[PDB]
Design a protein around this motif. Structure first.
Motif, mmCIF file in Angstrom:
data_model
loop_
_atom_site.group_PDB
_atom_site.id
_atom_site.type_symbol
_atom_site.label_atom_id
_atom_site.label_comp_id
_atom_site.label_asym_id
_atom_site.label_seq_id
_atom_site.Cartn_x
_atom_site.Cartn_y
_atom_site.Cartn_z
ATOM 1 N N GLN A 7 0.922 -1.135 0.335
ATOM 2 C CA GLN A 7 -0.046 -0.022 0.230
ATOM 3 C C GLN A 7 0.932 1.603 0.045
ATOM 4 O O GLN A 7 0.869 2.429 -0.513
ATOM 5 N N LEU A 29 2.424 1.579 -3.183
ATOM 6 C CA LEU A 29 0.431 1.321 -4.283
ATOM 7 C C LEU A 29 0.403 2.861 -3.867
ATOM 8 O O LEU A 29 0.572 3.511 -5.761
ATOM 9 N N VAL A 30 0.033 3.635 -3.600
ATOM 10 C CA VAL A 30 -0.073 5.588 -3.462
ATOM 11 C C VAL A 30 1.245 6.035 -4.079
ATOM 12 O O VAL A 30 1.304 7.290 -4.566
ATOM 13 N N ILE A 84 0.621 5.921 -8.007
ATOM 14 C CA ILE A 84 -0.050 6.433 -8.626
ATOM 15 C C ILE A 84 -0.436 8.211 -8.466
ATOM 16 O O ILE A 84 -0.772 8.855 -9.041
ATOM 17 N N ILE A 143 0.987 0.272 -12.798
ATOM 18 C CA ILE A 143 0.150 0.363 -11.674
ATOM 19 C C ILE A 143 -1.001 -0.246 -11.846
ATOM 20 O O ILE A 143 -1.480 -1.028 -11.103
ATOM 21 N N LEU A 155 -1.761 -3.492 -8.372
ATOM 22 C CA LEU A 155 -3.117 -3.020 -8.934
ATOM 23 C C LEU A 155 -3.983 -4.644 -8.651
ATOM 24 O O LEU A 155 -3.890 -4.943 -7.379
ATOM 25 N N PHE A 213 -1.836 -6.562 -6.132
ATOM 26 C CA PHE A 213 -3.355 -6.428 -4.684
ATOM 27 C C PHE A 213 -4.097 -6.841 -4.303
ATOM 28 O O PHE A 213 -4.143 -7.184 -3.216
#
Ligand SMILES: Nc1ncnc2c1ncn2[C@@H]1O[C@H](CSCC[C@H](N)C(=O)O)[C@@H](O)[C@H]1O
Ligand SMILES: Nc1ncnc2c1ncn2[C@@H]1O[C@H](CSCC[C@H](N)C(=O)O)[C@@H](O)[C@H]1O
Lengths: 610, 110, 610, 110
Positions: free
Chosen positions: A414, A417-418, A421, A584, A588, A591
């Motif tokens: 996570q 993740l951010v 993005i 990404i 995703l 994830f």
């Protein structure tokens, strides 16, 4: 039990080493009484030729020196047809082991306690109780003594044939011969040796009390061969290495650092006869892989002798004498063509200090000694596998998971993740201005010609040369069709109109068409590849059962492009945002499923015990 | 049974359409055959469930594609099979088409 | 041009209202000269009977009163066989429009300028140039005047038949009759009316200069019918509503708020003959839907007359007089069974102040008047659709997208993305302790019996009664099989072992099996449903072409469960983490593809202009 | 052609196995037929590409499933078809099986 009172009687005059000097004095007096009490019924009987009894200790006051002369006199009358022929061994112990009691009051009480002992099936099981109670009280006394439950299990898995000659390089207290005789109770040419005189006194005395011939027992250095010969059985509990005075004494044993457990291992190998089985207890410190000088020893042992079984004994089985972890090898000479069995012994609680090792814990190992596959605490390992490794390590182990660390790593995903993005978000908002200089058509800018159909001659997994089909890259033929490093587009597939850019030569399948620019002064191929990708060429295709793009219909496609200075600037912006989209979404997808498995297995964690 | 249609029934339907397409449209350029063979193949492909399986059960075709990219990437077997019979028709017509066009032009040679 | 010098001559004595009083005085003198100059050749000729010329203004000094008597005298000699028969109309204008010049010096110069004008094809096109130059200079003068390019286009699309009687409820300057005569140049019984005397003077004079009969022109109130009759053509540019003195004057026109553009709309409808076409320019403020009192007017107009076309005229076409947005209706009586055409006029720049409307902008509307489908600026709308709506609105519009707002909403999805996964993360780390009281088997706790096979009799989309199959809920039969609201498990499918919990009765298909607990005192069904889901029942199944779970093999499944107090606490924890898993992954899938379309369409934004 | 195997060839293979399974194993309980009909159906399903299409082309089956949940949710048509022929075998055997078991027990009635 009775012998403990004798130890308590021996008190003040020595009065410094109650641990072993009392046991040494007792065994010295007990052996003198054994010869005297054995000689009484051997030839004296009663009255035909009478012998003075127990008068040598208090001859004339105390005179231990005069006792030695009268003891000889008793044997002289006996020699009129063990112990008696090799009387030099028993006479030597009197030289090596001196008497230390100098109190008449103290000596008077012990000698009267000695004559009370009945040597018919009585003194035997009270002497080992004394020996066992000594090592727990003295600790250092465990150097010459090994756990009886260990010896009992070792000799049982040995199973000595009646036609055998058991040998011990360090006979110690002789517990192996006692268990070998007890194991075969329902003879064996026992041989032994030892260096310390106290253990030679204790070992010879204890073998006599169990009615075992002491003709093979001696006192010498086992590492110094002098001249020796192999024996059928070699079982021992070898000691630990030291070179206090023996630093330069063992010159011919080159390579070793003065390790007793290693030099005795070399001794047991030399003294093991063809076809003879063996079992040697050794510490784990000398079977590791980092033992460089010992790697030659393990190499020849594993090459010649049949080391087929090792038992893991918990730390520290070897009494309060040492807390080290030990193990017992089982190399039976013969041929080494067999994989190594391994048993790992575990107890209810740590041992040594109190509640030590028992013979109940060895029950599983005795039954499963010849059954290789056993559950839980035993396994089988390969010989050539560890011989092929860099270092030969004999410390074997057993070959036989959702935690809260998953969310810790899932939180890191996570974090990533951010991480991208938000970088992808703000990199899409640049809005770099641009103006189109030309507004040309695909008809007059490039050359669109499809390739022929290949008959699936070559479709290699890897190669320095690629082949493009209707969609994607399938095939690696060695012959190029279009030498130019240009743009290809799918034609006949259901994913037709796909724009694939090639940086190197290739062959063109009949399912795709090649685009090669007529004038390099107008268009930058990567910018055209993106703008052709933006046009969604699948709408151009027509068909019912399949979608097909005509070459003429692609020529009629209009494309507006700017300057070369701007095309490369836009292509670099277009390609970077595209790569982030693929990456990404790919992360995703990883994830997405990883959170699903983390959430499910955490549910199963609290719903199932196993 | 149900359908007597086979692959070689479908192929002859696609081959004779190419004989008609080649002669009526000249198509001297060899890259115009791609648009030509597609029209004969696309029109010859059946669309009924009985015709597709009966063709698939006959000789001349498999479920194995020559090109993996031509797979429709869908769960409908009907679409996969009609794309499959088409894929074979294009490569089966291909070997005979070039010869068919070569001997068609009897007007510039004797 | 010549008339502008006359306006400049009229100066000091009025000397306050140069805008309209000068034009009023000119038209008063110009009309007097027209009658005198027409009467010269009508019967006077030369010498047979001679007539004094231009001597009435300066008769005796200035005496405008004496001019009226001499003008009558000239006509008396003329009446010896328009204008002359209805001399009362021309004589009435002299009563209503008074003379105001009182300077002999000023009057001497204008009258000599008047006789210089040649009325043979000359004064006509200089009078409209004066009229046009007046409204741009005075603004308020545009009340009686409408744009000539508007009138020219309106009369062209009307196409008046030679056998027709054009009527204007507000004749104003008479520009409609001038354009109707010009349109049919290569007669029409013109009728007109007006209230303001100035416009009656300007309108009657301008019709005479174009050689148009003024027998139908009058001065009266059009809203007050008195007694009237319909006419073949009704074209007008009606005014704007006011009731300064007319608040209680128009009593019989009940419902209206005193709106001229609305009351005249009622007038034009009453005065339109059967089969007669019409065109009325009206402001947009009275065709909206909120006009409650006017909704009855639009309702009867749309019900009876054939309103088939409306033209959108930009704000503000109607000169500096008013900046309001106007439009022209085209209701041709007859039958209303036709959809309404709509044209929207657009110009290069805003108008009114300067560079006003031109006849070039109407060229498209004239050609496409009878061609319904026209691109860009015109369309067709339905009659019954807007009649069926709540309010009848006649303000029609044309029926004929990637931005940076997408990332704004995409950032909100990322706000919700972390909103729930961080809540999902920390809700998974609770680790509520639990101990299992029982360790039972599925054999002795529940009853496992599969249902029979239904013949696909009913498979409704919706229903109050469900049916469970091999996987999921398919079918809505009205007959239950298992009345209990229990747990069902898939059996024969490839997704067999799926655990579906039913809160209501249902029917059980042959592809699944029903679990019903024997004793409710031991297990909580939702806890068992989760623990059966945790066991992964698909491993229990065997088969080659299909996977199948046997009923006996499910009985042999062991399950450990705790107390009912804990089972509900764990089930609520188990169900909540599961719902978050399904929701977060679902939003991830939506977010995954939405970022892909946002990234692609943003690329196409800068690569394609359209 | 290629394969003469049809669905009713496959069904008779599955039906006669159920005649053998019912008689040898008694299975008086009607819920034991589910495990019984599955063994006759699963073993009767073909696995070759020629046999599957030839059965699929014959009469008695479609590509339409009675239960959507039994769809394998995969891109392989071979697996979808062998799950399809199996699905029909289970429901085709179902009507005849209950009667087959009803008249099988001639030992408790006359
Ligand atoms: N050079 C050497 N030669 C022979 N024995 C030695 C030695 N150095 C030490 N030892 C002996 O190793 C023995 C400890 S091992 C005693 C175990 C004994 N075998 C038993 O059955 O219980 C002691 O006798 C010690 O004296
Ligand atoms: N009660 C009423 N009756 C008739 N006309 C009226 C009126 N109230 C106002 N009007 C008139 O509406 C007219 C403005 S419209 C002028 C346009 C003229 N028809 C043309 O062709 O240019 C003025 O004549 C004004 O006097």
């Amino acid at each position: 039990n009775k012998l403990m009172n004798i130890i308590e009687l021996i008190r003040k005059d020595t009065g410094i080493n109650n641990a072993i000097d009392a046991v040494e004095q007792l065994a010295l007096l007990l052996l003198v009484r054994y010869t005297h009490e054995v000689a009484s019924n051997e030839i004296s009987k009663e009255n035909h030729i009478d012998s003075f009894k127990n008068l040598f200790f208090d001859l004339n006051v105390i005179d231990f020196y005069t006792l030695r002369d009268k003891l000889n006199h008793i044997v002289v009358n006996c020699r009129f047809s063990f112990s008696r022929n090799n009387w030099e061994k028993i006479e030597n112990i009197l030289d090596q082991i001196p008497f230390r009691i100098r109190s008449t009051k103290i000596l008077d009480l012990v000698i009267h306690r000695l004559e009370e002992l009945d040597l018919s099936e009585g003194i035997e099981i009270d002497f080992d109780h004394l020996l066992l109670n000594m090592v727990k009280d003295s600790g250092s006394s465990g150097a010459y003594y090994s756990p009886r439950p260990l010896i009992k299990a070792m000799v049982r898995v040995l199973n000595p044939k009646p036609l055998a000659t058991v040998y011990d390089p360090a006979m110690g207290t002789g517990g192996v011969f006692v268990e070998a005789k007890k194991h075969a109770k329902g003879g064996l040419s026992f041989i032994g040796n030892d260096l310390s005189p106290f253990a030679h006194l204790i070992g010879a005395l204890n073998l006599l009390l169990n009615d075992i011939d002491i003709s093979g027992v001696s006192i010498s250095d086992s590492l110094l061969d002098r001249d020796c010969q192999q024996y059928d059985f070699v079982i021992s509990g070898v000691p630990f290495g030291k070179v206090n005075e023996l630093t330069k004494y063992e010159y011919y044993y080159h390579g070793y650092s003065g390790s007793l457990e290693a030099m005795f291992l070399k001794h047991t190998m030399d003294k093991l006869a063809k076809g003879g089985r063996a079992a040697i207890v050794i510490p784990d410190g000398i079977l590791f892989g980092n033992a460089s000088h010992l790697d030659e020893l393990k190499r020849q042992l594993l090459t010649q002798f049949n080391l087929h079984a090792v038992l893991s004994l918990p730390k520290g089985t070897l009494a309060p004498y040492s807390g080290v972890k030990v193990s017992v090898l089982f190399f039976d000479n013969t041929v080494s063509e067999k994989d190594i069995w391994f048993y790992e012994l575990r107890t209810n609680k740590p041992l040594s200090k109190v509640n030590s090792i028992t013979d109940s814990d060895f029950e599983d190992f005795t039954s499963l000694y010849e059954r290789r596959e056993v559950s839980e605490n035993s396994c089988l390992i390969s010989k050539e596998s560890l011989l092929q490794d860099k270092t030969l390590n004999l410390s074997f182990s057993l070959p036989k998971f959702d935690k809260q660390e998953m969310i810790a790593s899932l939180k890191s995903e996570q974090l990533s993740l951010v991480t991208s993005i938000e970088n992808h978000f703000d990199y899409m908002s640049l809005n770099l201005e641009c103006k189109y200089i030309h507004q040309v058509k695909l008809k007059d800018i490039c050359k669109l010609r499809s390739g022929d159909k290949l008959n699936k001659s070559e479709v290699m997994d890897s190669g320095e040369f690629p082949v493009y089909g209707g969609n994607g890259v399938i095939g690696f033929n060695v012959e190029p069709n279009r030498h130019g490093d240009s743009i290809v587009i799918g034609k006949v597939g259901a994913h037709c109109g796909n724009i694939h850019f090639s940086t190197q030569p290739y062959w063109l399948t009949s399912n795709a068409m090649s685009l090669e620019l007529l004038d390099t002064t107008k268009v930058y191929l990567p910018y055209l590849a993106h703008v052709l990708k933006s046009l969604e060429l699948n709408n151009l295709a027509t068909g019912t059962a399949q979608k097909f793009i005509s070459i003429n219909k692609l020529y009629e496609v209009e494309v507006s492009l700017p300057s070369l200075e701007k095309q490369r600037e836009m292509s670099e912006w277009f390609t970077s945002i595209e790569e982030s989209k693929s990456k990404i979404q790919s992360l995703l997808a990883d994830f997405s499923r990883n959170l699903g498995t983390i959430s499910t297995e955490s549910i199963t964690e609290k719903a199932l015990k196993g | 049974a149900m359908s007597n249609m086979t692959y070689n029934n479908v192929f002859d339907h696609a081959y004779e359409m190419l004989k008609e397409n080649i002669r009526y449209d000249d198509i001297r350029d060899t890259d115009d055959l791609h648009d030509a063979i597609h029209m004969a193949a696309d029109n010859a492909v059946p669309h009924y469930y009985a015709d597709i399986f009966s063709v698939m059960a006959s000789e001349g075709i498999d479920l194995e594609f020559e090109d993996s990219g031509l797979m429709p990437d869908t769960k409908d077997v009907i679409r996969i099979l009609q794309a499959r019979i088409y894929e074979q028709l294009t490569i089966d017509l291909w070997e005979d088409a070039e010869d068919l066009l070569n001997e068609y032009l009897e007007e510039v040679e004797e």
